[PDB]
């Protein structure tokens, strides 16, 4: 089956988890309002 070949594509999978790092990062930033204190500098 060509369905498996397209499903397995390492290249489609690498973009996909590139966009996840970005997406989970954004989910991180949207949780900042839940914080009680921000430590900096």
């Amino acid at each position: 089956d060509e369905f498996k070949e397209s499903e397995g594509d390492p290249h489609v999978k690498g973009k996909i988890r590139q966009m996840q790092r970005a997406a989970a990062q954004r989910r991180m930033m949207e949780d900042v309002p839940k914080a009680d204190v921000i430590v900096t500098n």
């Binding site: 990062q25 991180m28 930033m29 949780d31 900042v32 309002p33 839940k34 914080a35 009680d36 204190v37 921000i38 430590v39 900096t40 500098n41």
Partner: protein, 84 residues
């Protein structure tokens, strides 16, 4: 610009260590400091602890034990703040 930011959430029950909800540098660090200030989240400059938390504390987890005392000192600071 500027280097490090760590956002903590104190535990749901009052007697457990706080967790990291966000950390970053330096654009990210800046953009956390910004959202925090925008949403009136108290922000303390404590450069040694910020670099440390940033190095060692895992997002979504309880801060590490090496850093409890220091993060408890940040909490006393948050209490000083609640009085003008």
């Amino acid at each position: 610009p500027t280097h490090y930011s760590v956002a903590l959430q104190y535990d749901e029950n009052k007697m457990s260590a706080p967790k990291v909800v966000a950390k970053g540098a330096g654009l990210i660090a800046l953009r956390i400091r910004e959202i925090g200030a925008e949403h009136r989240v108290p922000t303390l400059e404590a450069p040694p602890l910020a670099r440390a938390l940033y190095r060692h504390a895992e997002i979504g987890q309880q801060i590490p034990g090496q850093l409890y005392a220091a993060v408890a000192e940040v909490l006393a600071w948050v209490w000083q703040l609640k009085r003008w």
